[PDB]
Design a protein around this ligand. Structure first.
Ligand SMILES: Nc1ncnc2c1ncn2[C@@H]1O[C@@H](COP(=O)(O)OP(=O)(O)OP(O)(O)=S)[C@H](O)[C@H]1O
Ligand SMILES: Nc1ncnc2c1ncn2[C@H]1O[C@H](COP(=O)(O)OP(=O)(O)O)[C@@H](O)[C@H]1O
Ligand SMILES: Nc1ncnc2c1ncn2[C@H]1O[C@H](COP(=O)(O)OP(=O)(O)O)[C@H](O)[C@H]1O
Ligand SMILES: Nc1ncnc2c1ncn2[C@H]1O[C@H](COP(=O)(O)OP(=O)(O)O)[C@H](O)[C@H]1O
Lengths: 578, 116, 116, 562, 116
């Protein structure tokens, strides 16, 4: 019945079917199966984008071409359109008659093989309500009787969902594994298809553009298989070249056009390297050194890792870098990470490890299981990374996390990817991972017994070593011990905090001038190298903010104006007029 | 819009096949062109499950605008609001709306937090 | 065969839809004897946990034959393949099919796969 | 109801239901409950296989016979098919519309009684999927105000999972305790059912066969309760006997056929359950002496103790015996124990007591208290003795265990049992306890005695002493090792003969007064098996080959070739 | 090559999943990780990384395999290890050969890692 089946040999005879490239063994295996005594129903199983249909059509083509032995040559090969059978829509029982009429006629033709694409839609006869709900059962008798030979086609999940469970299929069909082609096979396939794309887009491709589409898609696109992933790049490059100009220019597509296309598909960056921003890249060290004073070594470690990735001297299975920051409190560990994401113009993903102190909570990172209270919540980490693949990832207080988080971190550090409980994957290769810790802190507050105090920083390192075991430590790029703030740093910190105050006052119409002597006094009064910068913020709050707050509310400052601060001879602050 | 809602439109028999199935052959053949639209969650829980349609579309990520982009969008739109309400906004009022909305409202992104 | 598909309710629209209960009077009255057939996972999911079965059926553990038996099974069936494909097999070839099968077959066991 | 229930009076009037034997008390109580003006709903609570459902059928039979108070006249007990009632719903309005119809048909009959089999899944929960519902709330105001009186049936565990916790059901039913019957009661049940089994299989059972079926099942089959498992033994023996006539065998089913059946069910070597043991015992000491050379006194002392246990002169509340095996390393304490378990046809359980030196490991053997980490993993000792109740239990180096494990041992030796952290009993009455030690008699005593104070030593049946090896024995041990290799080589087509100077050397080298025969395994393997394995695999020595092993006087190497 | 990392099996909580013990894990119908691997790839080399970290119950199972070649799963399957090579990797005692002495020479030794 011509209403439901397409004669593929007829298509090959009047063209319609292209020659198959690189799957000659696959066709011979299918023929070998068709000529068997039992299970002579080959089933082609493979990944999306690898040519499963192309192979089935390729057989009809070879029959017509004359490359098939007399055992199967001149056999009619037909392709079944389920949508046609189920298009009748109306009248219960007519669906079953249409299905049967087709099968009876195919049985009668005898020297006929039926090809069913998407065979898994027959088994269970899906169509919301269904078929021909028993379409599988209606065909099974001819498969069991050895009367019809069916070439199937499906994928791996569906093979498992149905073919591995329904023994009436398991004992009738013979699975053939159809794999993705090689780089060279893909190029040959593209070149075979090529004129179709060139004709559609009125473009031409260079040999290099073809090779590049294959190599770049393989390097960066991980949700597809060859040849389609490369074909897709070729088609998009074609459209890009076609639509880009006003005048018929740049008709020939080159590698650079391919690079732009792959870069835009993966939401990655490209390859200038310093695209048009290598000149902002070179200044990270300074933009950060103006915000974090001291700790130059931490700034540099981060800065160099970023440049290496941009320079191409990286590793395509690793995070951009993996750092553990440690040191005395109040020294800028989290300060540096936050400013880095700003300096780079990217999103910061923050997780606070103290909230994940139970094994139950790793479900809040991977994603709640199908289905217990729901499951329609992916992992917090998985979704954050997919939405923002270039983010800086900051995990605070890592030593406070439940130990199972480390199994998760080691996986990410080892291969660059984490799989969600729903099967989706997060790509961490463009993500910078920084973890911070206070693991050795209790040691730096300890005092020695004696006349001369000792340096306890080596004890702090021993504590780190006993928490983060060698298998973890051996996967990091750097464990960086941040220093205590020197007096010179304190002076820079005081100015930083004064500026933040000046900015807040400006919104009230109040300007503020502080003398150098007043600053020197606050700097002397406000710090302890053992405490870090946090106490400096506190001295400013008591010496400058309190007096101002009273005036802003009841002080002459209620309407805006100017204040100054001077230090007097008693080292007291001398207040403002207005 | 809300393309994940086209799945299951027809329903409950008498073999009544629904939509987003009745359309597979037209997207597959290149006969028609469509534009889809989903949120990340809707497209992470419903839309993607029917792999056949997921394969016929190109996913384009629409990200949140920057602060300056938001200000510019508002300047472009403000004549609609001025006309509607018989008001005039100052230049400072627009920039303040964007900065304050970002600092204090954490429920939505830009430029909605500012337009509202 | 595949008795667990008869035991579960909802075997098919129409089915056998109520097969699960329709078989019970026969198992209970003894008018018709049943020999069933299933696998190990289905057995523990269906029979071990249901009084309807735990009070009606016995289990016989069916395991694979020996390597020598696999060869004899083929030799018993062998003439059919020789006739079907107009071929003859070397006794060593029969043994090789089995001896090599044990180095790569576990996707299904022997003899069915050595026969293939 | 026609397609949901079965009329048990209709079956009783025809056949179907066997009269019950000996459960008059359970039936009298069920009647008192049914006769109440309210909450006249008995709930039968038991174990599987104890007459739990048989009672409901038994009552329907009495009713058609008329052996009931007039109160019960004209009553009909309908059995509910839960699967029929629950299957085929899906939509939200279907369960009720079906259950509502079932009840009105039953309700119209004031003498109707509904029987729910295993009431612990059709009362919630249960699984609320599509069409609602796996519910009892729907009955709950019926058999509680009320007009319908349903006989329930469940098990002790399910009872406490639902009832008690849900008062909604707990107070609508009267609980009736159904306990497993005794040996005598089981025999009487069989005798009354027997005529139908004899007719079915064209067999006759002896009186002894019936008693044996009951007692052997109790001793060897630990999967099921008595009044049911004893029936399988009778019916299975009958079934084989029904097929036996193909070889012209006889109608009578004797004890031997019962024994074959029990051993088959329990997965025990044939007839090791009964009389193969008499010949084994006659030859037990002799067989052990063929594998262990020397230690003749030890083997004989052990053999005699075993025989009196087998003779039945021991105690029920004890292990079948408790022995301490004392002596030097490598003298066969372990080897005798291993061969003994094989000789007797039973499995061996082994524990290394050196792994239980620390205080927290004591709970490792029994199981942690509930709420403590790992309690749900169970113990190591008590599950082993539940799974394998007839095993040989060997405890190595019991002269190193933490003192608390000795309290575990004293309890076992004293009364035969331990309680698991899940409340289950580990029954040691059919196992034999062998403990080994390097303690040594006064000194051996003080070193073990230190924990095995008189309070412990009085619980041992004996002390078996294991002697040092003589020079003749070390030569015999080597001959055994060489022979095992000779057998493997014959199977591979190679003949091997080791010279006398080669045997003397290996015996002298592989024996150490401080390790006994233990080092022998490597001396033989490294000097003889290894060099030979290399040649055989290389193919210089092939099937049909012969090697003779001589010593090189200046090296003492084992030298041979072909 | 089959691989397992013993650092993931430092407690009974996860050991049962590796073993395939009938009780003790989710996904029991699929058996153990170990027993399935030995069925799919019966001739494989089995590598256990960082064995000194393994919980004692892992060791009880390894001893069972060493004694008779078989572990039994409760889904009607057995892990037959007679065709595999078992390799354990350790770092025991390595640290002790890098220990410093308490002498003016010092050097003293090269210790034996076998002690650990
Ligand atoms: N080198 C620095 N330059 C300027 N400000 C700094 C510097 N170091 C610390 N600060 C200030 O003190 C920091 C207080 O917050 P954090 O930086 O997160 O503290 P931390 O150093 O990360 O240590 P923790 O996380 O509180 S234990 C602020 O980042 C800064 O205002
Ligand atoms: N007559 C024997 N005496 C001692 N050991 C023997 C004898 N025959 C065999 N063996 C076995 O001796 C060693 C094991 O000894 P074992 O039973 O463990 O002694 P024990 O338990 O007293 O320490 C192995 O060489 C094995 O062959
Ligand atoms: N080796 C080949 N020779 C000829 N055409 C091929 C080959 N491989 C793939 N194809 C063709 O099939 C691919 C599409 O896959 P298809 O056969 O429809 O199965 P699926 O739907 O799973 O992706 C390519 O887009 C198309 O050009
Ligand atoms: N006292 C008895 N008199 C007659 N038959 C009995 C008696 N006790 C038990 N039976 C017989 O009926 C029983 C029916 O099963 P039963 O023990 O009541 O509950 P369940 O089906 O849950 O295991 C036994 O399987 C069977 O041997």
């Amino acid at each position: 019945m011509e209403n439901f089946t397409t004669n593929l040999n007829q298509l090959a005879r009047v063209g319609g079917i292209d020659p198959l490239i690189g799957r000659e063994k696959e066709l011979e295996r299918a023929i070998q199966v068709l000529c068997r005594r039992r299970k002579n129903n080959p089933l082609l199983v493979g990944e999306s984008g690898v040519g499963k249909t192309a192979i089935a059509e390729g057989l009809a083509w070879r029959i017509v071409q004359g490359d098939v032995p007399e055992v199967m040559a001149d056999c009619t090969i037909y392709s079944l359109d389920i949508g046609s059978l189920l298009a009748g829509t109306k009248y219960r029982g007519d669906f079953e008659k249409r299905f049967k009429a087709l099968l009876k006629q195919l049985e009668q033709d005898t020297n006929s093989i039926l090809f069913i694409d998407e065979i898994h839609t027959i088994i269970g006869a899906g169509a919301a309500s269904g078929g021909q709900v028993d379409a599988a059962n209606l065909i099974k008798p001819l498969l069991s009787s050895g009367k019809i030979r069916v070439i199937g086609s499906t994928t791996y999940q569906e093979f498992s969902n149905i073919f591995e469970k329904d023994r009436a299929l398991a004992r009738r069909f013979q699975k053939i594994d159809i794999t993705e082609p090689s780089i060279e096979e893909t190029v040959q396939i593209i070149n075979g298809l090529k004129p179709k794309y060139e004709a559609h887009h009125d473009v031409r491709y260079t040999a290099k553009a073809v090779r590049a589409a294959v190599e770049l898609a393989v390097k960066y696109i991980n949700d597809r298989h060859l040849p389609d992933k490369a074909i897709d790049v070729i088609d998009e490059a074609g459209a890009r070249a076609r639509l880009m100009p006003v005048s018929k220019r740049k008709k020939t597509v080159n590698v650079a056009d391919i690079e732009s296309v792959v870069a835009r598909i993966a939401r990655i960056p490209e390859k200038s390297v310093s695209q048009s921003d290598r000149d902002t890249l070179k200044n990270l060290g300074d933009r950060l050194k103006m915000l974090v004073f001291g700790q130059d070594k931490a700034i540099e470690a981060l800065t160099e890792a970023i440049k290496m990735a941009r320079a191409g001297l990286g590793h395509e299975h690793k995070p951009v870098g993996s750092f553990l920051f440690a040191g005395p409190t109040g020294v800028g560990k989290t300060e540096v990470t936050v400013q880095l994401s700003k300096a780079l113009g990217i999103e910061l993903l923050r997780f606070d490890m103290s909230e994940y102190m139970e094994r139950h909570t790793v479900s809040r990172l991977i994603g709640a299981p199908p289905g217990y209270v729901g499951f329609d919540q992916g992992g917090l980490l998985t979704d954050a990374v997919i939405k923002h693949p270039h983010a800086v990832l900051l995990l605070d207080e890592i030593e406070k996390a439940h130990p199972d988080v480390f199994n998760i971190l080691l996986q990410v550090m080892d291969n660059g990817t984490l799989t969600d409980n729903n099967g989706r994957k997060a790509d961490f290769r463009n993500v910078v991972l920084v973890m911070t810790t206070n693991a050795g802190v209790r040691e730096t507050e300890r005092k020695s017994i004696g006349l001369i105090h000792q340096d306890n920083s080596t004890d702090a390192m021993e504590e780190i070593k006993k928490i983060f075991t060698p298998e973890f430590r051996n996967r990091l790029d750097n464990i960086i011990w941040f220093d205590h703030l020197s007096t010179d740093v304190i002076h820079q910190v005081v100015d930083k905090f004064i500026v933040e105050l000046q900015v807040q006052l400006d919104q009230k119409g109040v300007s503020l001038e502080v003398s150098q002597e007043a600053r020197n006094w606050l700097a002397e009064k406000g710090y302890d190298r053992a405490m870090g910068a946090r106490p400096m913020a506190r001295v400013i709050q008591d010496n400058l903010k309190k007096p101002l707050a009273n005036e802003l509310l009841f002080g002459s400052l209620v309407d805006g104006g100017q204040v100054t601060v001077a230090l007097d001879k008693e080292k007291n602050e001398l207040t403002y007029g207005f």
